[PDB]
Amino acid sequence: GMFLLQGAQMLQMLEKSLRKSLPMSLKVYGTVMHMNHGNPFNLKALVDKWPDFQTVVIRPQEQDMKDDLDHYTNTYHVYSEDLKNCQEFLDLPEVINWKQHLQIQSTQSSLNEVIQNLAATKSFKVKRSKNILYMASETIKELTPGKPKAIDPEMFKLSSVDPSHAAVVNRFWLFGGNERSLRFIERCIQSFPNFCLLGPEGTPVSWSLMDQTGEMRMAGTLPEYRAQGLVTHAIYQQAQCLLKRGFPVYSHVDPKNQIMQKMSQSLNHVPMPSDWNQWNCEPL
Template sequence: MEQLNEKQLKTVETQLKELFPQSQQVYGYIFQINRVKSDPIQVFVDRWPEFNVILCKPLREKVTTCTSLCYEEMVMAVASERKVPGNKVAVCHMMTLQDPSRLPPVESEIESTISSLDESHTDLVNKTWKFGNAEHSVRMIRNMIRHYPSCCVLDAESQQPIAWVLIYPSCAMGMLYTLQEHRGQGLAKALVSSMSRRLYAQGYPVYCFIEEENTLSYSLFTNLGFTEDPQYRAAWFDFNSL
């Protein structure tokens, strides 16, 4: 495998746009790498310039990888052959927004309370995230808040977040959450709308992954104009090491 340099990464970003939806997440990683200096991610290809395989590898001990569901058997077979313990974490719809004009306006009362997260909110996000409450997740969330766009609704009295959405290193929106006592007020819809407009205006790909069983979030994003390729699913696999 050959590790790509800065010039090659800029070339790859253009090439990957022609391979959506399969290349969407890798494209998101490359998009961020070319613009933001955060936690290092190494990018490898099987050969250059005509590559068939591209790999984004965060420099962490624990590895979670995403691939098209059609490659599940191959991924697990390679892990088994190398005696690497792993399991399938989630299977997701990939939802993209092509036309932000369908997004509803954010109510002025909510809009006035929208802000960005800061690093002091790391523990709050971590303890409410489905895959949080681990040392590596704290580091990841802190890095996301520090380097990438985020959006939250602040409580009028405490000025603490009561709902939020973040951006993963792959540019995908995620960790959307509203505290239990503040649900039913349209905060999630307002956050997704506000964040989507902001990302679109800055040239980001606007998309997210939604687990197949999460019908509530699927309906939310569909109603906001997000669409999917019905033939495509993304699957996450968790491995201890590579």
């Protein structure tokens, strides 16, 4: 079937249920936890059955998804116990609008077979990004049962990130470099607390952001200030903030990025037996 969850009680029940399927459910779990805190991206949680769902989809509002080309906006978060149920659910036009450029995100690699099955039926092309999934050791101990080297306090200060910094974040983001990606980064900065390090000029020189899924993403250091431990400090401070508020700490790393594999090991972030996935789907 198809049920729209409404209210904190139902979202809290969903968040509790998803804890039993971490880390495969992590991408959905993080999204729901941040929904339960003002729902700044105006998302909604769909299930095939309630309370004992087999499939959950987090999706945006139809009237926010005006630009068929804005795959940053057109993002869906999915987790399923039953791939047949999942394929029947994603087949419903009320669940996913396959006529737009869109992104499916999941920490469940087995959905690959479902998305490939629908590509035939729904007339879309798919490109998969599959990366190493990391979780903080502390999140693993809390949900599924490491300090940086110090830096010079009169050179670097912890700061909030102004929406005006989006243009710089956008220049260094592997998925960015365009106007739609800039707008998405601005929405993440406006919606969620983020950390940067200000350098000697009071300008941001290192940063780490969070998106609507609660994942730590879009981190960078200006070339002039690289290899001094700055991004490790920014991510450490972001992670401790999330942990204090009972949010999961997680991230991913492309296998090309050895630097962020090293950073992750230094902070006791652990590679998981689930992968990070993003399926980029566009109509034929």
